[PDB]
Amino acid sequence: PTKLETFPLDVLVNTAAEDLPRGVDPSRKENHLSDEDFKAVFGMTRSAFANLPLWKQQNLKKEKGLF
């Protein structure tokens, strides 16, 4: 594609690894949320989230089912 594919939050959270769409980086599911879902889930800009240390990004994602 011309850009990364997006999918509904429920699909990214509640799908077995083997069933995940091919267009989703399993280690960076947040990149595949729409802007609206990213804002609802994280409450900060994508750049602000990317500026958190990787371990903190992961910790936040774990509770949210996106790790």
Curated annotation (Swiss-Prot):
In terms of superkingdom, the source organism counts as Eukaryota
Its post-translational modification remark reads: Phosphorylated on tyrosine residues. The unphosphorylated form increases the initial rate of actin-nucleating activity, whereas the tyrosine-phosphorylated form inhibits actin-nucleating activity, enhances actin-bundling activity and enhances actin-severing activity by reducing high Ca(2+) requirements. The tyrosine-phosphorylated form does not regulate actin-capping activity.
According to the record, the residues making up region (Absolutely required for activity) are 61-64
Tissues where this protein is expressed: Specifically expressed in epithelial cells. Component of brush border microvilli.
Where in or outside the cell it occurs: the entry states: Cytoplasm, Cytoskeleton; Cell projection, Microvillus; Cell projection, Lamellipodium; Cell projection, Ruffle
For the region Headpiece, what residue ranges are annotated?
1-67
Coiled-coil annotation: which residues?
none
- HP domain: which residues? 1-67
The subunit field of the Swiss-Prot or TrEMBL record says: Monomer. Homodimer. Associates with F-actin; the association with F-actin is inhibited by tropomyosin.
Its biological purpose is as follows: Epithelial cell-specific Ca(2+)-regulated actin-modifying protein that modulates the reorganization of microvillar actin filaments. Plays a role in the actin nucleation, actin filament bundle assembly, actin filament capping and severing. Binds phosphatidylinositol 4,5-bisphosphate (PIP2) and lysophosphatidic acid (LPA); binds LPA with higher affinity than PIP2. Binding to LPA increases its phosphorylation by SRC and inhibits all actin-modifying activities. Binding to PIP2 inhibits actin-capping and -severing activities but enhances actin-bundling activity.
Instruction: State the family named in the UniProt similarity comment for this chain.
Output: Belongs to the villin/gelsolin family.
Domain comment, in the record's words? Consists of a large core fragment in the N-terminal portion and a small headpiece (HP) in the C-terminal portion. The core fragment is necessary for both actin-nucleating and -severing activities, whereas the HP binds F-actin strongly in both the presence and absence of calcium and is necessary in actin-bundling activity. The Gelsolin-like 1 repeat is necessary for the actin-capping activity. The entire core fragment is necessary for the actin-severing activity.
What is the name listed in the Swiss-Prot or TrEMBL entry for this protein?
A: Villin-1
